[PDB]
DNA sequence: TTAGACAAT
DNA sequence: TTGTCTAA
């Protein structure tokens, strides 16, 4: 509630960050962990190419890769009990909370 | 007659200008982070082992090198030099052990 | 005092570069990594006040052993601090002669906007940056530093098929590591680590560059 | 320690007296004209006769217990233990050259005994060595008196 | 294609002799001749030297796979 | 006491697997052979 | 960049 | 009594 708003029910975080975390979290559910640098590489390339709030729902390539990384290794809900996966999943959510 | 600059300070690139006089090939330090940021996590993995051996070897205790190598290969597992405290079990996977 | 004091530094950081290009596969001869600092005074200038060591002409390019198209320049910029301008100056030289890899041997540092444009240039513009300070030692000559060699993907396939192993549950190495920055390794490439152990004689452990 | 490559091992023994000939052309891109001449010789004067890739071996061979694992494959021991076994074989032959005792065993059966006891002394799977390494630095942690 | 240790380890022998000694108790049938003991551990340990314990072991490799070794074919120390 | 308890509970899972690699309680590979050669500490006394 | 807050023997 | 986490 210290990040939200009264009349509009959205938040004060910029849209690039909350797209980056939304794409990184569904990659770490599969437990890819090779793409959590790939997503920040491609969104820095996109935001360098055309910075805009007009990407309201998703960017096309961030959402396209986080669909391809879910489709590849489709049964990857079971390969995500590793230390390194829960490491990044605790670290990124703590970085978004702080 | 192996003369040893047994210093008391921590500056690793301070001594790199004196390469024509010092034998920098067999350099050493107490600090794990200084050699971890200068030489590497594979060269700050053989300093953790030597330092635990020296601390136990002041007091006459002989700890076998397999135990020390196992601890140094556990702590430098993620690529950085992690503790074994409360703030190191957040990397682990099972919450019952946490 | 930059007469002998800079001659020794430039000879040393040329030796660390030409022991780095040989350490990554590039074509370096025996004499190019055994210049006894007299022949370096023969084959370069001496007084930087006279400008006879031309740091705009210390740049060298090498070819790789697998194919001579894969080349790297070793840039020595005169400017102690590097901004957007010198990166855009050098990338004109990179794009005009069709390279993809290059290394910049800065003297003091580089502006964080230029590091952002160095990381985020292009995935087809492979770019690196070394300080003038951390190239007086050649850290792979250290006793505590093992033998690092790169690993091709087929060998990654077989050493994950042996142990019934996934890439999540392998030990890691960061990409800011001075030996992983030394070998210029991107993410995903496993490196092979040959430890001069004292219980055994050698030990092989494998790390993902994460 | 000494560095290795196909081109470097070619250069060392074949081209030093060759580029010791007189050439005084300029540094093309900061590299010596001898090195331009040696890259010329390597690039077109030597094609498919590159036996330097076998003279300089492509690597050292791996340790005997990384390749050919020790639990199945007999006589795959460490390099330190191989050195110890071979030094004791050299010393054992010297003392058994003049020794008026039995000597019921030869060098091969002695080596087979030592390699078998290296294999049988492997830590068996399921050992829980983590607690054994956490007690070895925990039970004399109580004995480290400050004085 | 089974590549693990051909030697039975110590924990293998402990569980095999434990379950086999409980595969002797509760009127369970015995497969060697006995000199007359009442402790089932002696009985189960004499069948180990007999290699008569028929138990198959599923040695769990950490993937989730397993190999089926037989106590008949495992080499005791 | 506390130090030994913490080193215990960060090393409770490192059992040696059948493929002789020291893995944790979830599959995470620490070492490829135990103690960099593979042996045991009690059984290395007469080597 | 630095003071309160939180847990362990 | 440490040592990091959180808020100003």
Tab-separated table of C-alpha atoms in Angstrom, chain D residues 54-146:
chain	number	residue	atom	x	y	z
D	54	UNK	CA	50.237	-34.052	-32.658
D	55	UNK	CA	53.711	-32.923	-31.568
D	56	UNK	CA	52.151	-30.486	-29.157
D	57	UNK	CA	49.499	-32.793	-27.754
D	58	UNK	CA	46.016	-31.267	-27.812
D	59	UNK	CA	45.946	-31.500	-24.018
D	60	UNK	CA	47.479	-33.539	-21.310
D	61	UNK	CA	45.417	-36.686	-20.736
D	62	UNK	CA	42.866	-36.467	-17.961
D	63	UNK	CA	43.383	-37.954	-14.482
D	64	UNK	CA	42.828	-41.680	-14.229
D	65	UNK	CA	39.869	-41.291	-11.860
D	66	UNK	CA	38.022	-38.669	-13.868
D	67	UNK	CA	38.190	-40.697	-17.039
D	68	UNK	CA	37.795	-44.429	-16.173
D	69	UNK	CA	36.097	-44.036	-12.741
D	70	UNK	CA	37.601	-45.937	-9.773
D	71	UNK	CA	34.722	-48.060	-8.443
D	72	UNK	CA	34.471	-50.345	-11.489
D	73	UNK	CA	37.661	-49.888	-13.447
D	74	UNK	CA	40.552	-51.607	-11.670
D	75	UNK	CA	43.990	-49.971	-11.277
D	76	UNK	CA	42.644	-46.433	-11.754
D	77	UNK	CA	44.226	-44.602	-8.825
D	78	UNK	CA	45.388	-41.056	-8.193
D	79	UNK	CA	48.623	-39.665	-9.602
D	80	UNK	CA	50.026	-39.223	-6.096
D	81	UNK	CA	49.298	-42.837	-5.206
D	82	UNK	CA	50.698	-44.024	-8.533
D	83	UNK	CA	53.916	-42.129	-7.781
D	84	UNK	CA	54.055	-43.664	-4.288
D	85	UNK	CA	53.464	-47.210	-5.605
D	86	UNK	CA	56.126	-46.794	-8.278
D	87	UNK	CA	58.733	-45.349	-5.897
D	88	UNK	CA	58.109	-48.236	-3.523
D	89	UNK	CA	58.431	-50.715	-6.402
D	90	UNK	CA	61.811	-49.194	-7.279
D	91	UNK	CA	62.904	-49.363	-3.627
D	92	UNK	CA	61.459	-52.859	-3.108
D	93	UNK	CA	63.401	-54.297	-6.032
D	94	UNK	CA	66.583	-52.776	-4.588
D	95	UNK	CA	66.090	-54.298	-1.148
D	96	UNK	CA	64.838	-57.636	-2.556
D	97	UNK	CA	67.891	-57.833	-4.840
D	98	UNK	CA	69.893	-58.830	-1.740
D	99	UNK	CA	67.475	-60.303	0.811
D	100	UNK	CA	67.750	-63.929	1.926
D	101	UNK	CA	64.100	-64.195	3.028
D	102	UNK	CA	61.148	-65.780	1.208
D	103	UNK	CA	59.952	-63.100	-1.270
D	104	UNK	CA	56.854	-65.101	-2.183
D	105	UNK	CA	55.503	-62.226	-4.292
D	106	UNK	CA	56.800	-60.309	-7.292
D	107	UNK	CA	56.411	-56.690	-8.363
D	108	UNK	CA	53.196	-57.362	-10.273
D	109	UNK	CA	51.417	-59.057	-7.383
D	110	UNK	CA	52.641	-56.314	-5.039
D	111	UNK	CA	51.232	-53.637	-7.353
D	112	UNK	CA	48.004	-55.608	-7.752
D	113	UNK	CA	47.699	-55.760	-3.958
D	114	UNK	CA	48.197	-52.013	-3.575
D	115	UNK	CA	45.848	-51.073	-6.429
D	116	UNK	CA	43.221	-53.449	-5.043
D	117	UNK	CA	43.492	-51.872	-1.605
D	118	UNK	CA	43.179	-48.443	-3.171
D	119	UNK	CA	39.973	-49.575	-4.873
D	120	UNK	CA	38.552	-51.291	-1.769
D	121	UNK	CA	39.248	-48.184	0.355
D	122	UNK	CA	36.867	-46.013	-1.667
D	123	UNK	CA	34.207	-44.383	0.485
D	124	UNK	CA	31.106	-46.444	-0.048
D	125	UNK	CA	28.003	-44.701	-1.429
D	126	UNK	CA	25.648	-43.493	1.257
D	127	UNK	CA	28.447	-42.393	3.546
D	128	UNK	CA	27.002	-39.035	4.705
D	129	UNK	CA	30.412	-37.384	4.631
D	130	UNK	CA	28.895	-33.959	5.240
D	131	UNK	CA	28.388	-34.602	8.932
D	132	UNK	CA	31.823	-36.211	9.134
D	133	UNK	CA	33.256	-32.956	7.801
D	134	UNK	CA	30.998	-30.935	10.102
D	135	UNK	CA	32.124	-32.832	13.228
D	136	UNK	CA	35.837	-32.976	12.359
D	137	UNK	CA	35.745	-29.176	12.549
D	138	UNK	CA	33.214	-29.252	15.370
D	139	UNK	CA	34.491	-31.664	18.010
D	140	UNK	CA	37.957	-30.041	18.341
D	141	UNK	CA	36.099	-26.718	18.241
D	142	UNK	CA	35.360	-27.493	21.897
D	143	UNK	CA	39.037	-28.220	22.606
D	144	UNK	CA	40.470	-24.944	21.242
D	145	UNK	CA	41.276	-23.367	24.591
D	146	UNK	CA	42.036	-19.671	24.295
